[PDB]
Design a protein around this ligand. Structure first.
Ligand code: MG
Ligand code: MG
Ligand code: MG
Ligand code: MG
Ligand code: MG
Ligand code: MG
Ligand code: MG
Ligand code: MG
Ligand code: MG
Ligand code: MG
Ligand code: MG
Ligand code: MG
Ligand code: MG
Ligand code: MG
Ligand code: MG
Ligand code: MG
Ligand code: MG
Ligand code: MG
Ligand code: MG
Ligand code: MG
Ligand code: MG
Ligand code: MG
Ligand code: MG
Ligand code: MG
Ligand code: MG
Ligand code: MG
Ligand code: MG
Ligand code: MG
Ligand code: MG
Ligand code: MG
Lengths: 205, 80, 122, 156, 129, 82
RNA sequence: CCCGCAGAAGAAGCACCGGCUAACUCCGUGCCAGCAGCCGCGGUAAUACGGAGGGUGCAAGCGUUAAUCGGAAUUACUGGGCGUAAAGCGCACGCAGGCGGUUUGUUAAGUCAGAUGUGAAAUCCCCGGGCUCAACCUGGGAACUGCAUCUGAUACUGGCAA
RNA sequence: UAGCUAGUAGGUGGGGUAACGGCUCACCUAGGCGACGAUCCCUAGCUGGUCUGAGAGGAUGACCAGCCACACUGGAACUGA
């Protein structure tokens, strides 16, 4: 299920920074971010239309940690749902519980947040939720249970999150170690470098 | 008010019985053309009053023979 | 073209026959090797391609290509055949399944092992 | 400001007394995104010269297209040598769903949401020309109201 | 033989617009006058005039805007070989509502938008774009 | 004869009964005349769980329809609670 | 289902990398061995045959075969054609059949509008609810493009009369 | 596959069925079906639905539900609502 290989390899192949590491050190210092991975990394082949569409889809999937079947189901639900298809797809991926935990700051990486969620450190409305793909609803309180409140990695992740740029659609209390999911993140709140048209076209072949 | 159909008398040779075409103007399922389709019915008529080529109003009834389950109600436009 | 003509006579769908009629809508079928031999390929290329005349369980006698380097097959050897033609071999429309009943996997293969019935090396 | 993309490069021959003389043809499309789109076709002995000639020709001979909020105003058909083309004003968010050359032409033109399909021949040169012609033969509500001597509210 | 006079009328309009003729004349009929009235109301023609007593001639005055024909395309839809009838919910929108569709309804010949507003269908005579 | 009974529906270990009037000879989940309610044995709190159309049930009983023991208990519960 | 114990401890594979099609180099072999869905590849520098390294795509699955629809507007009703690419009977007359210049009246068959009955439940779709999520289950609606009967409209088509 | 059909088509009367009826019998009439495809041959359980398709369509009828047919093969009745 989960990708268990080197993460900077994915970052180099994609080209951009996927935030696959905690971010204490520069990714340029941790790896040759410019060069592609492999024996023929220095060469930069010209990508075709299908190549760039596939590249964009892979970027989103690698960022969020979602395999093809689950991602395809997300697209199907987004297309079914009313409104803009790409915006709905991004909204669902944001709605994922592990993404929510990472955004609030109870995890250095999304993998670390997923680790906590799987190991039963997360309570949603006073209910211990175990699935990373759990869709968080608006006006949901998400809190760290007392068993995991003693973990030092949570505090370190909170400091890293304080370093990062804060999301407007969440309200997190670090002392209580709990955040409320105020609303679905708008497309303006989400990152601009991500392109949705390519994903929509690729899955609408 | 009772359900009834009008039609032309195709044949009246068998005694007390007539054949009544009830051609209907249906539309084709696929191509959308309106096609004239025909429905021959054996109709029971006492006194053998009907001739060929006339027009007759008929109603459904309990079966009177192997193929005869319709009865005449009134003859209209019986010119020759 | 005219709707009146179409009403009189509709359009009759062009029934496309299958190119592997011996399988009879089955994924694979069992047979007995009547003869094992080699044949010369068609014009632009050259080789000695290994083929088997096989009597199928449903009476049909077909010719089937033997993929991979080397084979242990011989006469009176039960094999499993699947669809797929070799193009530059006239009248050969079926492949033998390597790693099937009385058919050994290709020796010393490290890639496409699943296609050639080769078990994982340690 | 002008976004440009190369659709196809094709190798052609002349077959002269000595031997065969090869040369390259470049089909390009440029556009401003805001509605102006223009195609160019060039030819040279070498690929870079052909592409540059095509770019110059495409930069010239542009045409304005009436765009409604980044999409078409009504379903439009377009025809040429072999290419028969249909395009539909799809809703916002669907993206440009078109095949190859039509995708390139519409993307540089600036239409973000359409449902298109290319019937008949799909030869890149003819389909580009047919798509541009179809875009040209597309009037706006203001244009139809003016020509018919009515207000936009009467036309709706 | 002449089978459909309405198609002849539409063909005359189309050929006249193509040939840049100012007016087109044809043997007048009641249905033709109704269709001409709808066209004039929608503004695809400048005026119409029926002239004569025994065998009247309908004369339409074609309309031009900037050297191009106002009637870009005009297509017959219902025809003797294939009649077309639509219900009020299935009435088509010509050119996404910019063009008009002439529909003969129980309350006379009217445009598709007017028929939709009334809330009843009828026989779709022709599309005008 | 005509009777009001439960038809089992749902998933394994999570039954959900449809209260239906049907000819007794027909199969449990088979042909039925009318669906006059539902019963959820595993319904959680803040859920009605039971819903019986009492008017239709009374009409069928007047017509001469028998009632299974479980449906009778459900009717008793509904009338008692309401 | 919950609580406690221990220790990263017990848990990754398959296909592909010449173009179509995302992913390349070296070595072995020399029209042989072999590959192949199509185009093709191999005769001594093979990114296409085998091995290796690297990479790409899916993932407790991954490939191959069989089968249906799609792409195929390649049976074209929506939605094709017939001078030369396949396609106008050698030519005419003509029954059945298809189509019908113009005006008025009448009928209400086709057509349109409304209403009533029915179109089982499940399935599909919309708004919700319950399984920690999902699959799954479930409440209500919508839909079931239909058929029948009744009441109206009379522009067009049909019938009848002039 | 272009002609098919003598209980065949209709009528009168008796008999039979829980019930109408060539359902059966006697007599009388010479009809009935068919190019809007009768007859004959090959294949096939039907539907709600399923898959695919933008749609129209195309393919299909496993599981669930409704209906029909069959119970080693070919006949027959008895008991019984
Ligand atoms: Mg073609
Ligand atoms: Mg490539
Ligand atoms: Mg290979
Ligand atoms: Mg070499
Ligand atoms: Mg190789
Ligand atoms: Mg296949
Ligand atoms: Mg088709
Ligand atoms: Mg053609
Ligand atoms: Mg010739
Ligand atoms: Mg020819
Ligand atoms: Mg001739
Ligand atoms: Mg007339
Ligand atoms: Mg006539
Ligand atoms: Mg009527
Ligand atoms: Mg239903
Ligand atoms: Mg829920
Ligand atoms: Mg439901
Ligand atoms: Mg009339
Ligand atoms: Mg009349
Ligand atoms: Mg008798
Ligand atoms: Mg008697
Ligand atoms: Mg009978
Ligand atoms: Mg059978
Ligand atoms: Mg299609
Ligand atoms: Mg069928
Ligand atoms: Mg079975
Ligand atoms: Mg047996
Ligand atoms: Mg028996
Ligand atoms: Mg008994
Ligand atoms: Mg008895």
């Amino acid at each position: 299920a989960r990708y268990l290989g080197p993460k900077l390899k994915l970052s180099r192949r994609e080209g951009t920074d996927l935030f696959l590491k905690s971010g204490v050190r520069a990714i340029d210092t941790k790896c040759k971010i410019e060069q592609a991975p492999g024996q023929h990394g220095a060469r930069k082949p010209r990508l075709s239309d299908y190549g760039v569409q596939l590249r964009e889809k892979q970027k989103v999937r690698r960022i969020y940690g979602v395999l093809e079947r689950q991602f395809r189901n997300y697209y199907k639900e987004a297309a079914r749902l009313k409104g803009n298809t790409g915006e709905n797809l991004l909204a669902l991926l944001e709605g994922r519980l592990d993404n929510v935990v990472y955004r609030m700051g109870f995890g250095a990486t999304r993998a670390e947040a997923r680790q906590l969620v799987s190991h039963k450190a997360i309570m949603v409305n006073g209910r211990v939720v175990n699935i990373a793909s759990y869709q968080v609803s608006p006006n949901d309180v998400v809190s760290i249970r007392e068993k995991a409140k003693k973990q030092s990695r949570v505090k370190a992740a909170l400091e890293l999150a304080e370093q990062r740029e804060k999301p407007t659609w969440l309200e997190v209390d670090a002392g209580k170690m709990e955040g409320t999911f105020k609303r679905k993140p708008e497309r303006s709140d989400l990152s601009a470098d991500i392109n949705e048209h390519l994903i929509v076209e690729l899955y609408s072949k | 008010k009772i359900r009834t159909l009008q039609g032309r008398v195709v044949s009246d040779k068998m005694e007390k019985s007539i054949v009544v075409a009830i051609e209907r103007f249906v539309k084709h399922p696929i191509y959308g053309k309106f096609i004239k389709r025909t429905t021959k019915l054996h109709v029971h008529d006492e006194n053998n009053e009907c001739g060929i080529g006339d027009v007759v109003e008929i109603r459904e009834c309990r079966p009177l023979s192997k193929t005869k389950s319709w009865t005449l109600v009134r003859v209209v436009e019986k010119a020759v | 073209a005219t709707v009146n003509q179409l009403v009189r006579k509709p359009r009759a769908r062009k029934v496309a026959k299958s190119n592997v009629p011996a399988l009879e809508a089955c994924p694979q079928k069992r047979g007995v090797c009547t003869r094992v031999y080699t044949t010369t390929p068609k014009k632009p290329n050259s080789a000695l391609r290994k083929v088997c005349r096989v009597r199928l369980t449903n009476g049909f006698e077909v010719t089937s290509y033997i993929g991979g380097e080397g084979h242990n097959l011989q006469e009176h050897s039960v094999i499993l055949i699947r669809g797929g033609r070799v193009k530059d071999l006239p009248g050969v429309r079926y492949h033998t399944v390597r790693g099937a009943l009385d058919c050994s996997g290709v020796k010393d293969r490290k890639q496409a092992r699943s296609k050639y019935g080769v078990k994982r090396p340690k | 400001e002008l976004q440009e993309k190369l659709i196809a490069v094709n190798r052609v021959s002349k077959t002269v007394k000595g031997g065969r003389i090869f040369s390259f043809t470049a089909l390009t499309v440029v556009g401003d995104g805001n509605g102006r789109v223009g195609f160019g076709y060039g030819k040279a002995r070498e690929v870079p010269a052909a592409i540059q000639k095509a770019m110059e020709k495409a930069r010239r001979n542009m045409i304005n297209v009436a765009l409604n909020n980044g999409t078409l105003q009504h379903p439009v058909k377009g025809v040429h040598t072999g290419s028969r083309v249909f395009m539909q004003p799809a809703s916002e968010g669907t993206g440009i769903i078109a095949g190859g050359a039509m995708r390139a032409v519409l993307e540089v033109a600036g239409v973000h949401n359409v449902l298109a399909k290319a019937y008949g021949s799909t030869n890149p040169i003819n389909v580009v020309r047919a798509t541009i012609d179809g875009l040209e033969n597309m009037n706006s509500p203001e244009m139809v109201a003016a020509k018919r001597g009515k207000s936009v509210e009467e036309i709706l | 033989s002449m089978q459909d006079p309405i198609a002849d009328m539409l063909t005359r309009i189309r050929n006249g617009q193509a040939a840049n003729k100012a007016a087109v004349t044809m043997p007048s009929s009641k249905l033709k006058v109704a269709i001409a009235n709808v066209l004039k109301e929608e503004g695809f023609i400048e005026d119409f005039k029926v002239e004569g007593d025994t065998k009247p001639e309908l004369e339409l005055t074609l309309k031009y805007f900037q050297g191009k024909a106002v009637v870009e395309s005009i297509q017959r839809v219902s025809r003797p070989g294939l009649r077309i009838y639509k219900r009020k919910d299935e009435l088509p929108k010509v050119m996404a509502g910019l063009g008009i569709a002439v529909v003969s309804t129980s309350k006379g010949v009217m445009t598709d938008r007017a028929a939709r507003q009334a809330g009843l269908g009828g026989e779709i005579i022709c599309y005008v774009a | 004869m005509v009777t009001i009974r439960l038809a089992r529906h749902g998933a394994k270990k999570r039954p959900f009964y449809q209260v239906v009037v049907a000819d007794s000879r027909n199969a449990r989940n088979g042909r039925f005349i009318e669906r006059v309610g539902f019963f959820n044995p595993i319904a959680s709190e803040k859920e009605e769980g039971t819903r019986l159309d009492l008017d239709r049930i009374a009409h069928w009983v007047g017509q001469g329809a028998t009632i299974s023991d479980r449906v009778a208990a459900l009717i008793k519960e509904v009338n008692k609670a309401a």
